[PDB]
Symmetry: D3
Subunit: 339 residues, 6 copies
């Protein structure tokens, strides 16, 4: 967990995040060509950053956003596929792992159902070792099919990695779920448009802190005809302190080294702010001192989570009373979203 | 949700938070005397802040921290009790609601079990309308008995309020639980010692954002013989933007007006960042466009929460593999905490 | 007054400001083509921002700055004219109001006198409902003819709007004049070049505060051969708090919702910082308590304003004693500016 | 205009501002005693700050706020008087000028009318050379009689000084009036209570910028039984850049040197941001280039100021339509303020 | 190098810095009593911070500043002495090392020569293991005798420590000298008065960065009759990033853990920003590629340092041409300083 | 030392720094063409900035970085040469001095040895008046030959100027050396790639402060195939306060006026923070008061500098014990760098 150098050591994983300029594309050939610009960018960056072990690109960075449904279906990728092969070759040539975005990934029932929004982790041998499909799409505007699972994978030098996408990160539950599965780095790939700039920068830091985990964020830049993307790609320590952060600049890069031993030492030895530990041993000093065992309490005291797990439909109904009953609102109508 | 004025309107609740100087006390009489200084402070503040409807004091602000176990047991309060009556009279005289700290509140099995760490909400008639016992004590150092329940209560002008204490706030689950029960303001009362200053200031904003809720934080100041407390009491909008924030100054005050209609309008009409709504309707545009109903998906996709609710002991065991097996660590031993 | 979402409600006006890349143009045809890129940008933005009711572009965003006098005269627009018609069609198609820049607008005595520097407000039916000519040109460098009047117009959902241009905003008098005419949003369109970046960002916030008014600022970006423009387009609450702010990025966008009811409630019910009210009822508590009526004092106690209104030439003479007597200075001479 | 050193030169005036802890006093004797603590503080500060030429104390720093009307009348000062003599002796002994607060200053019709809220500038010979009575009292809460005039006085080393008080500074008109009378330093003495902290810090900088003038602010600290005061005393350059700023600390001090030659050079030679000059020569390049003289335009184009000067009652009536008709509001009633 | 927790591990040294309130003292007995308040504070802090291995107090924190020469001579300490014994006992009882200030330390020719300004490092057995006398006193105002040597000592867990005092830190040479002697933590103890607040906070970070070293700063707070002290005690990583920082609050505390292995790994493996290494191997890639050996260049290319070492009097003469010839200046005269 | 205006006076030097977009070039013709774009940019900027006396471009701004050794050798410049003549003509036409980058400058033994990395200062007559070759190349990645000398030259209006390059600035020694030779402005030209953004911005301010000197920094922007450059070109006062700073934007410009008389007044009259003076008169008040002369002490008390000057090889050996023995590290190997 240290920032400023271009090197990395046997204890540290050199992570680069890219403020990749959002493409405005329409055909399969254009996608392939942009895939190759990414590949070239990986190989070039490696020459300047000899310590780079992991390079991260934004959500949508391969296809752009395919606003047109037909173009969406026509460019949807197979995984593995030609785009992933282009990326795999760059990771091999540059001896780095990478995180890349396929939007869309063909549904099992393509073209009858919406594609997924997917990330892949590719290792330095070129193999796909995690495939993550976005669990919470950025509705209403965006129409991908929801995924249903998080993953943790052994990454470079053994660092445990989970991937999440953009809007997923707004929900503390997903970062918790990944850290509780043992993630040591959560990578959040986004195509995060203005308005919500200061709140997203803050949310990555607050989630790093709350879950005692390293966080890397790669966010898109530029204007694509519809949205403008605010950059601020960043790498954050497990103590919630920023390592380095880009500004809004197109094809900005940040680079930091995260220590494997530091996060393991901390998760073993921290006490007051060992949040993963504390959550499942509540009140331990109190119970010891009251003669009731030395484990604290583990039981979940939060009715919302008890209800959500037992009766998802009742949790939904409860939220609808606080918010609204239909996915759309007549005060700000959107075509194909009912109100 | 607006800051700068000392007034309040029929739509807005005037909230004051107090950077109360941490007391260093030892006897019941000293506690009573300090209770009366708080009462006087409420009545004085009301003369300068005619819009104040809710005043908030820090965790420990009535007793200080009773580091000595015997003094702890000897000063533990009854609720209702003499301290609460002193506070109630101030709220009546000043025509304000208030939030006050009793640390400890006698256990049902006093003095055989550790006291609770408790907050009360008192209305402007002087009645106790919520009593909250801290669910996650700041172990290892602090030895209160854990509570087990959150609450939502109708507050001034109908604003829905939940109370949480200090270390509770480090855990996104509790803010979620309160907002999902319908809280519109979460009040976090703390005696938050250095070191973790910048991370706690940030966590309140990030939780306001993530849960679309107003947040008020009152934190202690000064040095009490053991800890120094960093202040930065604050009131935050439901959009994650700070309304006003104190510095580290002793007996600093901040004051802001929060709109009842604004938060209700937003929870009804917001779309992209209606996080309470979205969490329980995932992928709605995707499913509509794939011919699968117009509700999105509600089911909980996060294994950690499924496990925690079904098998708390397995969740505990899983965390212990990532962290450590005993509540204490031999690398930083603490008396009465095993390792 | 809330930030983060892409929606708007019946109470809120969705405002988008654009960090539009400064064009470098020379002919009428080039102007028309760039007018059409703006039009396309409006229509695209609306697809991503369903709540947008008002879109704002920078000063000079249609023509760029015409540094060459002949090109200036040759591209000067008629209002209404072909450029305004292009904009009007976009506002209709996207169902939004907009603010656009014509620099220059032909003088009544074109081409014998310098053109105006003008803004138009176009409604969602495509009609021009306010035309504002810049009252204080950015002399010495820029050579437009000065306008002489501010305006207030009913805007989207009834929000009252006034327009001002760049250098105008450096003068607190103009923001006051607009707010005192009843403006609820002042829109400041600028092509604000480096150096003065931090002072202009601050001045918009301080004027929002001082005049209890919403402010939107759209500022240009990029380098145009002469100047570099620093962006930081922003939307600010009437309490002086930023809603959202761009960085320096080309074609950045910010978006925020401003509440109609919130600003009306405040102007009716605020007391200590009701600055519009207070300025014309000075010392009201003092006079009441001294037996002298319950209105305070309204009379203007400031000699400068009394003099400026009665004897503009004497005010000028007075300033020249404090500054200098000629428009130019021999220590930094500029061609055609005498010293 | 330079910060960091404790020295001053023949070109620079050494200014110290004091975050003076707000007193809580009740009798004339207590006032006298606190006057003497201020005097001692001046003399001590001079030993550490050999360059100090001007020392500034907050509004209310001599009496505190006399919330009780009888105590108000009983402690009201004569000017000159015993309190001023105590201050005068310190300025002589320390060879410094100073700015001190008398709240109240007996009305000409004492005790039949409310006292003024007054500042004095005392020179290094001990003579009172400016007496300023607050033009805009902080109504509703505070009940002083309004003054009606600003002043400019020759200060240390010839630096021209004007004094203003707290709430006055919220109104850009007063800073303009002072600068247009030739002020080179405006001193703002305040007892500025929370809430409005960030807006007041910003307003001093924005007024320094807008009026091309040095600004010094001394603000009170601590809690006085009613209000908490937020400090942040500061000295600001004429270019709007902070020289140095205190935090919220009790009896904090800041010290900076302001250059006499720098501000005179600037007011003579600045061009684009010579705001005092520009306001009264609008459109000069435009008129020259349109064949209409080389002076620009001086006439006041702002209807609000024309109306306020000609018909103060009509300006009042106009504001009341935008705000409210009575000084008080029934939604937040205050005793003795009608609604 | 991680912040937020109260623990420490076998790899990390728990450092606490104290914003100690500046005493205003006059006799030996008062000094002894304040020495005992420090001792009590160490022991109390240890109960809240079980990981604390090193506690740091500000310059002057034991005596205050003895402005009166006779009181200076009368309270000057012997080292070892009664004050050091009081501190030693606290370090033993709390099992911590500490850094304490003796101002003055009797000169070898006491009372015929000015005392030193001295820091001691005391280990957890109570032994004094480093004594540092300030090399660059804060002239003109302060009159201590200059020391002439820096030191590096093995500290807790083997972390190498050097001590420096206040004004010393303004000079990059001293931090370099300590790091080049092998220091891994430089501790800067200060009684750093306003004005220069933002520049000193920045200088500690910039020196941490430039010398690849951990830095801890303890600075005094409050007002002592002469000066006000601005706090902002801090602990900084070797990468220049702040771990934690106090505000201006009296008796504020910060606490952070610095890793022994992290700084050793970095000094061994960093490349682009291994500044200690690079300075003495300049141009290594260039020389290798030009066929001239693989060591780069070590020779000192800076004439100032060559001159200062060879001919200190010529270096002095050279500086006097750029600045002034006498220690005092007639434009700001100070008694006993000639001009 | 003042910011905001586009003018300059007989006392002030108008400095512009350029966030020049890093070129990606391969041949001599491409270099010449880009040289001409710089020339055009100088002439255009002058039309908008009539006060500009000095314009500064980043390191590498003429050639880009020539990553390929053959292209490096093929484009290496002669000085004077065709590129310098292109720049000289622009400085004449625009009546400005300028700072330009030649990377590489042919070695005396070209093409047998690596080129230098060089800056030139060109006056407003077009003459080269300083040529500086980088003393500390950014090894390992970059392979220029090291220079060995700093220079001070009379600049516009007599302001004394020294030039330094990028990585040089990480070493406080070089800024000291220049200021001690009499530099009043140090110009740092960089092609400073991410990661180290916040540390470099801070280092320029801290060096301005520590050496009582004006600083101008021009840094590159964009992505060049290998690195991304972070901009933040800036001009800083001698008191360490930023005048103006760019963001990350491509071809951003900042402009500020630095006063000749202000820095001379300060270096003559400052006392507590006259760091150039103090370093060579240590302990002056102490010695005077101890009867030992009125000059303080000049001798160098820092063993590292004594050793480095006397025995560079021993200084090297000493550093290698703290860091490592070879220029390369096997944990992060780089081709042609041994380990
Ligand atoms: Cl999505
Ligand atoms: Cl607790
Ligand atoms: Cl203009
Ligand atoms: Cl008042
Ligand atoms: Cl000293
Ligand atoms: Cl280099």
């Amino acid at each position: 967990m240290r920032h400023g150098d271009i090197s990395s050591s046997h204890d540290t994983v050199g992570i680069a995040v890219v403020n990749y300029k959002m493409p405005r594309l329409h055909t399969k050939a254009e996608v392939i060509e942009n895939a190759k610009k990414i590949a070239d960018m990986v190989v070039g960056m490696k020459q300047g950053l000899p310590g780079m072990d992991l390079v991260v690109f934004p959500e949508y960075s391969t296809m752009g956003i395919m606003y047109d449904q037909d173009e969406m279906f026509a460019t949807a990728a197979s995984i593995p596929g030609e785009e992933t092969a282009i990326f795999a070759e760059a990771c091999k040539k540059a001896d780095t792992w990478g995180v890349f975005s396929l939007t869309g990934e063909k549904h099992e029932d393509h073209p009858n159902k919406a594609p997924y929004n997917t990330l892949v982790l590719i290792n330095n041998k070129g193999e796909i070792v995690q495939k993550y499909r976005k669990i919470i799409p950025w509705c209403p505007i965006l129409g991908w099919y929801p995924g249903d699972t998080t993953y943790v994978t052994e990454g470079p030098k053994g660092l445990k990695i989970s991937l999440i996408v953009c809007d997923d990160g707004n929900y503390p539950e997903i970062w918790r779920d990944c850290a509780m599965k043992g993630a040591e780095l959560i990578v959040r790939c986004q195509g995060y448009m203005y308005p919500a700039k200061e709140q997203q920068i803050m949310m990555a830091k607050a989630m790093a802190w709350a879950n005692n985990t390293y966080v890397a964020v790669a966010n898109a830049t530029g204007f694509d005809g519809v949205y403008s993307y605010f950059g601020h790609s960043a790498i954050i320590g497990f103590d919630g302190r920023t390592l380095g952060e880009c500004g809004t600049e197109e094809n900005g890069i940040q680079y930091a080294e995260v220590s494997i031993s530091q996060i393991r030492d901390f998760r073993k030895n921290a006490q007051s702010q060992n949040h993963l530990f504390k959550l499942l041993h509540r009140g331990y000093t109190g119970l010891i001192n009251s003669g009731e065992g030395d484990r604290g309490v583990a039981e979940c005291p939060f009715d919302f989570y008890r209800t959500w797990v037992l009766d998802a439909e009742k949790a939904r109904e409860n939220v609808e009373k606080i918010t609204r009953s239909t996915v759309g609102t007549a005060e700000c109508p959107i075509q194909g979203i009912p109100n």
